[PDB]
Design a protein around this ligand. Sequence first.
Ligand SMILES: OC[C@H]1O[C@@H](O[C@H]2[C@H](O)[C@@H](O)[C@@H](O)O[C@@H]2CO)[C@H](O)[C@@H](O)[C@@H]1O
Length: 358
Amino acid sequence: SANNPWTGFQIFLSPYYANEVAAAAKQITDPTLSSKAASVANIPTFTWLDSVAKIPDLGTYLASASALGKSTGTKQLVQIVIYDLPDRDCAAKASNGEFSIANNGQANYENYIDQIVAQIQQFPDVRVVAVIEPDSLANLVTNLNVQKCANAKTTYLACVNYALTNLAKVGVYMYMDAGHAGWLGWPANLSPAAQLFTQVWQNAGKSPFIKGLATNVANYNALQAASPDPITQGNPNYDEIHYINALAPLLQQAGWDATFIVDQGRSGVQNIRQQWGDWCNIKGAGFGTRPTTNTGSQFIDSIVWVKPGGECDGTSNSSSPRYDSTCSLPDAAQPAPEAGTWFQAYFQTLVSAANPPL
Ligand SMILES: OC[C@H]1O[C@@H](O[C@H]2[C@H](O)[C@@H](O)[C@@H](O)O[C@@H]2CO)[C@H](O)[C@@H](O)[C@@H]1O
């Protein structure tokens, strides 16, 4: 590979996360633990554009990044997540979003992307790296018999295409979400997954800005497992390095020099789940390996922190329309607030259990 988006750039630290972390650390009673938690705001994370109201935030982040770059004599990089599909989260309930297909979803999303493009277009000196629509494509590999997913398949593909095609015109480096090793990493899923991703890549014109795929976003898999998690029984690809070593060659066969980024933001503590599919607020997770480009794998551009640890995965209140029974499992921290909202006790455990220690 030739073009790693991080080379020669300084990552712009998320002010949104920083404000959450500064607030959470002053509430942590242990003094050294509070110091460690406070330091989390200096670790680069991805900022989620999980609703239109966040688009002005992206405005202020690019402008701050531009200024930081001019004043420090560096080139700055802003890390974002495109996550506002119509009928979002089609195989769960916890992260249902603000747009729906039956309520002008297609148009709302295209306007969402347009407004994002118009922001990024005003700051050519700032590089952007985007993860494209967590969970969407993977749902279209394994969840087509889910009627919500099946009904939204063509909307998902159209919208993902619209994001890819139009963010490319303002030079955004993009990694399409590709699930994780327990999802698409199953050997029998590798080829169907690859066929989808290469179709999506081809449909977006094979633009050089489509770098490749992101894995483990908002999940907890090891990148390189010391020993296989017991939940991984039956899958030889028990960790993300196995998944990626098995999937990436298929992408290259079709001529896509595809590279990867891997969430490790909540991967510090392994063996914390009853079943692999337990994804919601897993009790006892720690912050994992810090973001770095020294990945040890020919396919991986960066270890990253995509899901901001401490922001909730979903509510445990079964009276909310966004209740998902996954968020009430014995390995899920409860009680838990609405997804995307701050979960103070979960953040403290992420700090305490961080591996490597903070
Ligand atoms: O990993 C985060 C997403 O997981 C999704 O559920 C997956 C799960 O990850 C797999 O381990 C397996 O259970 O397949 C599931 C899909 O049916 C979930 O739908 C999303 O809400 C999560 O963000």
